[model samples]
Target: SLNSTGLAQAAINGLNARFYESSNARWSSDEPWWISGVALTMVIEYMRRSGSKEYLDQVEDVIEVQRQPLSWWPSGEGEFRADATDDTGWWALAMVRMYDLTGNEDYLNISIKDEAYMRQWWTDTECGGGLYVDIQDLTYKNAIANELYLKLVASLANRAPNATIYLDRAQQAWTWFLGSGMINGVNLINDGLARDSNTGSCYNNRLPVWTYNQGVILGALVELYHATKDESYLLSAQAIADAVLSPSNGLTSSSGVLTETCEGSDSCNQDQQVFKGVFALNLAELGDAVAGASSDPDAGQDYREYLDTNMQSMYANDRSEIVPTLFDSSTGDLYDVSWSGPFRNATMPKQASAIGLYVANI
Candidate 1:
């Protein structure tokens, strides 16, 4: 189980220590656009859980940087114009969290305004598609990018009482995801597939199903259901959750759907495992109904236990620096010490441990 008090303190320290790491431009190549957002989100959530003024203040500084025009500006080009999805999304999430922590109107306003800008990224097609990763004229659809987009929508719903723009966009994306990506009777999405039409960046098979995409989609569905009380949201979340828990779903070789990594030859497997833990924890938060229904109840008392056990195993196996490298099970270590290794350090083991505490608290 996670030691909430310890986690709170450790997370606060981690944020403080690493605060300047990215500011110094010390990150390795191949770091994703959403990477910075991960640390920001972690700090924001830690502040929420611990209610520490110091933590909140640190978060404010980070948000101040993000609020700058250059940091969150839109490119105004096209679907893939140099927009700021990752930064904007994290900015929105941090803003909402700050609002919740301090009841600050400024923070809320920032998030609400950015939420509108984010909606412009989504195209007005019946299928409802958006640029996958970066802010270019690309048309690739990444499940993980859509997942973060949905989270930004969720944050907007909580902070901006009058804005439902992203809510509608999230709904459209949900529909598009189901119609285009979700496959198999088990509800497991193909790693990533593409359409050949005007869909300019349709290299679908180039990637495999990722843990974040699975987790975030389920989280988005739960958020949608909570906001709208729609049965479809709950049902969809449940189905996806089930698919993730069953390895037979074709996403994993394990009996449970959880895989050890994503798709990179470097440390993709380890990354995938870390993401699975993340999604499992996220699903647990959606509600017991979603998590419980997806697990073999008779086989296990609670779904969290099952997921937690697997996550703990991955964490133990991780042996990188502060965090384990994306695991290469055969070697029992990370491939490269650059991006994936440090990424796992920043997001995986610590976050997974924090999640364990959250589960224990519940």
Candidate 2:
């Protein structure tokens, strides 16, 4: 089925056949809610891009099921107001995309409420003014939350009604972010900032540069540039993109496929399984922005090729060689953890990761 005709659509159908449960709008296995949030986003974006209403009915059901607890807290925290700010931001970003597709006030309203919850964790006393990782202690500041915050506000600004305030929030967040030192000397983003309890200051902890951390910021910059008409935001975004795109930077393999630092040892955890997918999703976002730019859309050709090459490699390398085999289900289009790979156990995350790339090219 992955052969050439309708490969992308076949992949999507394979994903649904293998993983999705329509009864409660849940996925199989123990996939985390944040990762599930990104999965939902992929479906919506794919539907919007390819002009199909394939999974049209699942949107509200998935959000409704996910926002509440398994048994209790049905109405306590409405629409993904998670204790961890990054988790909430992930759903918030998803709602924004849903809003773009459906034009439904409920989706936008949930995004507004989720943004408000994220704002409650923003503190100027630490990290110059960025959303803290958690609401409990409000101490640690990380790349994911801050990047999501910037992207959320900028994306909201690009939408309807009250645009100016979100644009201001986006600008303010970007200023603090640039000075936060999370984007290292190499232009790749480290994990989080090391903080001083006494001084209330922060510095980069020099953690391993993760692909998702490299990604969300690029999405943010694209939205920021769209909101403010600032070419400089695009420039900052391009620099970061170039850092990951460069083979000498080690983010890519010798053949130029995207590889996480943990991938070489095959030690990536379940969460890491979803990171490159997020990276691919945002890279497509940047490529879309670049192609639409008035300043020479042809500049996006490299980004386009990069995505195509990676997608092709994934098709050629990461799949099951036989039906109902180890990583292969009955569907056989299932993807493994490594995009450039010798095959690992396939699951919702890896399958969903490849779905993002496949749908993007479609």
Candidate 3:
């Protein structure tokens, strides 16, 4: 469905220049640390999809600017203070992807280190084994952290030779995660586990099923299936994917554009603003995996159609020129936080989310 290559590239070209603060190699300071990594990932994939390295120097530069382990630095590097395992997972995801497209071992090795870092927080003593979110307290296990563990290890296993340990970790994570009760009766993942410290019991927090909670697991299951050729993983992924895409689930608008729960109330935060894009990217992954498989060529066509429709809607309804005042060149389209939208404001996360459609389609 990348039938509009010029439009996608044009959108990406304008996107590449809008989100930086040129003095430093990193993103605009308003960008959250973890979201910064995800944004980098969006650009990397865009470069791959278009067969161009328009932002190669900035891509490599941001990686160097943010590599941690030192206390502090002056040139806008080194700020490893308060990010959770999910945050590490994002950076890890970014690094592995950078390796995949560039064939750079240095990038791959960073993910290996990130994998080790996440494994430290995983424990069986509580919630029957999960990667907890907080650094200090042993409580607070969430869908994002554990889901990332599955995707990250499975991704590493798929890419690395002698990846038995990563494979084992991926399998173990899926086993625990599947039994963890985070996936509710509707087949959607809730926020996390609720720790009843007084009674010493943990259960599903049963909060809103954020879109990314659903999105993140789809990518993980696809990676898991790829790692082991397990049909069950694909079946499980298709079920979840089907649920989110269904109108009854309320994850999407009456039209086709993906919608965050908070978006309806006009209370979406910076993090929530970026979620639909995560769904778009993973849904694209699931679509490719399902369509490419010998047994299910026809199944993924629907997924691709759905993604194309959403992007088409964004192009027709959501694209506007706002970044850097920051347009009159190419698609110059600053995508709205509400993709179906009022078309009001733009930021790094909002625009980053829009490009997922472009990159995934290519």
Per-residue CA lDDT of model 2 for 53-86, tens digit only, reads 7777876789888877534333326578876888
Report clash pairs, candidate 2: none
Q: TM per model?
A: 0.70, 0.92, 0.92
Candidate 3, residue 356: how far the Cα is off, in Å: 1.1
The number of the candidate with the highest lDDT is: 2
lDDT of 3: 0.79
lDDT, candidate 3, 1-362, per-residue tens: 44555655666555656777667666657677778888888888777767878778888888886785433223222332234778778888888888988999988888887788778889888877888887667668999988887899999889877699999999899888888888888788899898787875678889888988888798888988888898789889888888898888898778977888898789988888788888888998898888877576676987888888887888777887633435543336677788777778777788778877777777
TM-score of 2: 0.92
Give the 10-residue window scoring lowest on summed lDDT in candidate 1.
331-340
Per-residue alpha-carbon lDDT of candidate 1 for residues 32-125, written as tens digits (9 for 90 to 100):
4344445455555555655556555555565555445453334432211126554456456646666777888987777666656666666645
Candidates 1 and 2 compared: the better one by lDDT is: 2
Task: In angstroms, give how far residue 25 of model 1 lies from its true place.
Answer: 11
